[PDB]
Design a protein around this motif. Structure first.
Motif, PDB file in Angstrom:
ATOM      1  N   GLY A 123      32.887  35.117  46.091  1.00  0.00           N
ATOM      2  CA  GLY A 123      31.477  35.383  46.313  1.00  0.00           C
ATOM      3  C   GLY A 123      30.635  34.743  45.237  1.00  0.00           C
ATOM      4  O   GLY A 123      31.076  34.571  44.097  1.00  0.00           O
ATOM      5  N   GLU A 124      29.408  34.387  45.606  1.00  0.00           N
ATOM      6  CA  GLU A 124      28.472  33.801  44.659  1.00  0.00           C
ATOM      7  C   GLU A 124      27.870  34.889  43.783  1.00  0.00           C
ATOM      8  O   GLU A 124      27.523  35.969  44.264  1.00  0.00           O
ATOM      9  CB  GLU A 124      27.364  33.055  45.403  1.00  0.00           C
ATOM     10  CG  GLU A 124      26.489  32.182  44.519  1.00  0.00           C
ATOM     11  CD  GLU A 124      27.240  31.002  43.936  1.00  0.00           C
ATOM     12  OE1 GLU A 124      28.242  30.572  44.545  1.00  0.00           O
ATOM     13  OE2 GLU A 124      26.829  30.504  42.867  1.00  0.00           O
ATOM     14  N   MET A 143      41.408  43.227  38.746  1.00  0.00           N
ATOM     15  CA  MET A 143      42.509  42.689  39.539  1.00  0.00           C
ATOM     16  C   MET A 143      43.636  42.294  38.596  1.00  0.00           C
ATOM     17  O   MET A 143      43.536  41.301  37.872  1.00  0.00           O
ATOM     18  CB  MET A 143      42.040  41.502  40.371  1.00  0.00           C
ATOM     19  CG  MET A 143      43.013  41.090  41.454  1.00  0.00           C
ATOM     20  SD  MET A 143      42.283  40.023  42.706  1.00  0.00           S
ATOM     21  CE  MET A 143      41.348  38.876  41.708  1.00  0.00           C
ATOM     22  N   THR A 144      44.710  43.081  38.598  1.00  0.00           N
ATOM     23  CA  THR A 144      45.909  42.738  37.848  1.00  0.00           C
ATOM     24  C   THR A 144      46.797  41.745  38.585  1.00  0.00           C
ATOM     25  O   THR A 144      47.755  41.239  37.992  1.00  0.00           O
ATOM     26  CB  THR A 144      46.717  43.998  37.542  1.00  0.00           C
ATOM     27  OG1 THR A 144      46.907  44.746  38.749  1.00  0.00           O
ATOM     28  CG2 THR A 144      45.990  44.865  36.528  1.00  0.00           C
ATOM     29  N   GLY A 168      46.128  46.978  49.776  1.00  0.00           N
ATOM     30  CA  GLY A 168      46.119  48.127  48.892  1.00  0.00           C
ATOM     31  C   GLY A 168      44.729  48.451  48.380  1.00  0.00           C
ATOM     32  O   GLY A 168      43.731  48.105  49.010  1.00  0.00           O
ATOM     33  N   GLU A 169      44.668  49.119  47.234  1.00  0.00           N
ATOM     34  CA  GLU A 169      43.385  49.475  46.647  1.00  0.00           C
ATOM     35  C   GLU A 169      42.630  48.201  46.264  1.00  0.00           C
ATOM     36  O   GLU A 169      43.219  47.308  45.639  1.00  0.00           O
ATOM     37  CB  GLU A 169      43.601  50.358  45.420  1.00  0.00           C
ATOM     38  CG  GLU A 169      42.335  50.876  44.769  1.00  0.00           C
ATOM     39  CD  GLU A 169      42.627  51.803  43.606  1.00  0.00           C
ATOM     40  OE1 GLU A 169      43.819  52.021  43.305  1.00  0.00           O
ATOM     41  OE2 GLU A 169      41.667  52.314  42.990  1.00  0.00           O
ATOM     42  N   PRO A 170      41.350  48.070  46.611  1.00  0.00           N
ATOM     43  CA  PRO A 170      40.654  46.809  46.350  1.00  0.00           C
ATOM     44  C   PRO A 170      40.338  46.626  44.875  1.00  0.00           C
ATOM     45  O   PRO A 170      40.250  47.582  44.101  1.00  0.00           O
ATOM     46  CB  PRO A 170      39.380  46.936  47.185  1.00  0.00           C
ATOM     47  CG  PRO A 170      39.090  48.385  47.178  1.00  0.00           C
ATOM     48  CD  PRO A 170      40.422  49.095  47.127  1.00  0.00           C
ATOM     49  N   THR A 228      37.244  38.706  44.648  1.00  0.00           N
ATOM     50  CA  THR A 228      37.650  40.000  45.166  1.00  0.00           C
ATOM     51  C   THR A 228      38.949  39.867  45.954  1.00  0.00           C
ATOM     52  O   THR A 228      39.432  38.766  46.227  1.00  0.00           O
ATOM     53  CB  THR A 228      36.555  40.599  46.049  1.00  0.00           C
ATOM     54  OG1 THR A 228      36.314  39.741  47.168  1.00  0.00           O
ATOM     55  CG2 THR A 228      35.265  40.786  45.264  1.00  0.00           C
ATOM     56  N   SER A 229      39.522  41.013  46.313  1.00  0.00           N
ATOM     57  CA  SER A 229      40.719  41.068  47.140  1.00  0.00           C
ATOM     58  C   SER A 229      40.398  41.266  48.616  1.00  0.00           C
ATOM     59  O   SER A 229      41.317  41.478  49.413  1.00  0.00           O
ATOM     60  CB  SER A 229      41.644  42.187  46.660  1.00  0.00           C
ATOM     61  OG  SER A 229      41.081  43.456  46.923  1.00  0.00           O
TER      62      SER A 229
END
Lengths: 226, 51
Positions: free
Chosen positions: A62-63, A86-87, A97-99, A110-111
């Protein structure tokens, strides 16, 4: 912070520096640089402007807004669920999974593939001119004055145009006022101490205020009477 | 009843374990606050174990 951040323009610091005959060649060009250096070196969150701005995710990307410096949180626009760091090392790369999220530059990884996310981020309060806008707290002004003075005297001392005792005194004063300003902008107010108290004393601990936007970090924890 | 034509009731028979025409303060009621405190403190214990 007990006090309020009433904003004033940058040359309020040059009002005060140029009283000193050895700082008369300082300019707004130098004031801007050393003021930004002081703002960052101090890292006080009350000096930044809290803003919220929504963006769309194209595909795990995303921008990012132009004025962003730090992100308080990221959440999904429709659910309101907050995102974590984010690992994962292989987010947008598939096998044969969890975002969560991650931000480096103008891009946020992002995921999620296609969704809108709300980002609460911090920026700098600007002037009618595209310049930084500083608090008028005299502690902050005095500490910034001492920062600029200390840098200029360090230059002059590298040149040999300032006695070492003068620079030592300047550094001592700046160190004390840096500690003073750090404590002034950090120590909670009475209304913030109510939030801290409500967070602290909990018979049933609340450990899920990150999912919300830390909305209920400070709510009182009322136990019914039986 | 033999002498009172008005004395009648239904098949339902029972009693309230109350005190002095009040609502009953049952045994579960007087043990419940301790059970709730137990649950909260054991929640703390579980979180301390987890950490």
């Amino acid at each position: 912070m007990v006090n309020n951040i009433n904003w004033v323009k940058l040359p309020v610091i040059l009002d005060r520096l140029l009283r000193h005959p050895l700082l008369t060649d300082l300019n707004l060009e130098t004031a801007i640089q050393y003021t930004l250096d002081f703002i960052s070196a101090m890292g006080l969150p009350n000096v930044y402007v809290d803003k919220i701005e929504t963006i769309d995710i194209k595909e795990y990307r995303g921008e990012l807004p132009c004025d962003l410096i730090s992100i308080n949180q990221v959440r999904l626009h429709k659910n309101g669920i907050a995102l974590r760091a984010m690992t994962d090392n292989f987010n947008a790369y598939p096998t044969h999974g969890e975002p969560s999220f991650k931000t480096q530059g103008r891009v946020i990884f992002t995921s999620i593939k296609h969704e809108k996310v709300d980002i609460s981020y911090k920026a700098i309060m600007l002037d009618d001119e595209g310049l930084p806008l500083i608090p008028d707290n005299p502690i902050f002004l005095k500490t910034l004055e001492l920062y600029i003075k200390k840098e200029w005297f360090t230059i002059l001392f590298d040149m040999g145009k300032i006695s070492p005792a003068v620079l030592n005194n300047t550094q001592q004063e700046y160190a004390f006022k840096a500690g003073q300003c750090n404590n002034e902008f950090v120590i909670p107010s009475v209304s913030e101490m109510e939030a801290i108290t409500n967070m602290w004393n909990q018979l049933i601990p609340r450990v899920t205020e990150f999912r919300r936007g830390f909305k209920n970090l400070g709510d009182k924890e009322y136990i019914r009477v039986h | 009843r033999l002498n009172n034509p008005s004395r009648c009731h239904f098949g339902i028979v029972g009693s309230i374990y109350n005190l002095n025409d009040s609502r009953p303060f049952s045994l579960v009621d007087m043990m419940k606050p301790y059970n709730y405190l137990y649950d909260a403190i054991h929640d703390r214990l579980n979180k301390a174990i987890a950490s």
